[PDB]
């Protein structure tokens, strides 16, 4: 259910870490959860322009985020 | 104050993420913090080796990480 998001390296793609080694296994285009922001859960989708972003919420960057499917 | 622990490109240096736009401003070798481990916090110091890692905790990776201060 709750993660959180980040970048991995070795697979252009953003990934979600569950558990201290429990992972999603890497975010694809289209992909849909819910990102926390203070006390509510915002519906976003992650899509690939020029790189990765959110349609949904405007943050100034993807990283960190706490998340939830 | 809880946060996300996560890889910050712009430095190369792991940062935590506080809130939606609030973040540490990027760890320095010797910072210590709690780690997340099950309902558990544990202490750790961050230190630079062949790259960034946990003294006090033996992890796969740093990224996602659930930390405090």
Known sequence: REGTLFYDTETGRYDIRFDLESFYGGLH?????????????????????????????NVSRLDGLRVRM
């Open 29 to 57: 285009c289209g992909e849909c959860f819910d990102v926390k922001v203070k006390d509510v859960w915002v519906p976003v989708r992650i899509e690939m322009g020029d790189d990765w972003y959110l349609v949904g919420l």
